[PDB]
């Protein structure tokens, strides 16, 4: 260099005590908890369309006791209506997986 300086510092002051910390922190994570949202909210929707269709399949089984009322086409109703019960059990448990999932898409 081609120049000079005259910098300096004063003497200390009687304030002795805690003067250092360990507050250093960092954060980052994969999106997998909401990749699971995108799968499970789609699982809700597909198991809901399979549930509207299970309603529609039970209406097609009512359409069967309409056309040929054997005790089976009425029991076959209770079977299609049993898929609606499968599907409905799922969607309560599924929409609750979401209420747990969704409450972690926050994090």
Swiss-Prot record:
- Outline the segment boundaries, as ranges, of region: Chaperone activity: 34-107
Q: Where is this region: RdRP binding?
A: 34-83
Where is coiled-coil annotated?
37-104
Location of the protein in the cell: Virion; Host cytoplasm, Host perinuclear region; Host Golgi apparatus, Host cis-Golgi network
Tell me the segments the record calls region Homomultimerization. Answer: 34-107
Query: What's the domain of life for this entry?
Result: Viruses
Q: Member of which family?
A: Belongs to the hantavirus nucleocapsid protein family.
Q: How does it assemble?
A: Homotrimer. Homomultimer. Homomultimerizes and binds to viral genomic RNA to form the nucleocapsid. Interacts with host MAP1LC3B; this interaction participates to the protection of Gn from virus-triggered autophagy. Interacts with host SNAP29; this interaction participates to the protection of glycoprotein N from virus-triggered autophagy. Interacts (via N-terminus) with host RPS19; this interaction probably mediates the loading of the 40S ribosomal subunit on viral capped mRNA during N-mediated translation initiation. Interacts with the viral RdRp. Interacts with host SUMO1 (via N-terminus).
Q: What does this protein do?
A: Encapsidates the genome protecting it from nucleases. The encapsidated genomic RNA is termed the nucleocapsid (NC) and serves as template for transcription and replication. The nucleocapsid has a left-handed helical structure. As a trimer, specifically binds and acts as a chaperone to unwind the panhandle structure formed by the viral RNA (vRNA) termini. Involved in the transcription and replication initiation of vRNA by mediating primer annealing. Plays a role in cap snatching by sequestering capped RNAs in P bodies for use by the viral RdRp during transcription initiation.
Instruction: Share the domain note from the entry.
Output: The N-terminus is required for chaperone activity and, in trimeric form, this region likely serves in high affinity vRNA panhandle recognition. The N-terminus also contains a coiled coil region, which probably participates in but is insufficient to initiate N trimerization. The YxxL motif is indispensable for the interaction with host MAP1LC3B. The central region is involved in specific RNA-binding. Has distinct cap- and RNA-binding sites so it can bind simultaneously both the vRNA and mRNA cap.
Q: What protein am I looking at?
A: Nucleoprotein
Organism encoding this protein: Andes orthohantavirus
């Amino acid at each position: 260099m081609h120049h000079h300086h005259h910098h300096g510092k004063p003497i200390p002051n009687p304030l002795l005590g805690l003067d250092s910390t360990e507050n250093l922190y960092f954060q980052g994570i994969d999106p997998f908890t909401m990749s699971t949202l995108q799968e499970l909210q789609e699982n809700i929707t597909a198991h809901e369309q399979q549930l509207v269709t299970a309603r529609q399949k039970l209406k097609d089984a009512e359409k069967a006791v309409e056309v040929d009322p054997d005790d089976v086409n009425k029991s076959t109703l209770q079977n299609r209506r049993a898929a609606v019960s499968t599907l409905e059990t799922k969607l309560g448990e599924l929409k609750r997986q979401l209420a747990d999932l969704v409450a972690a898409q926050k994090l």
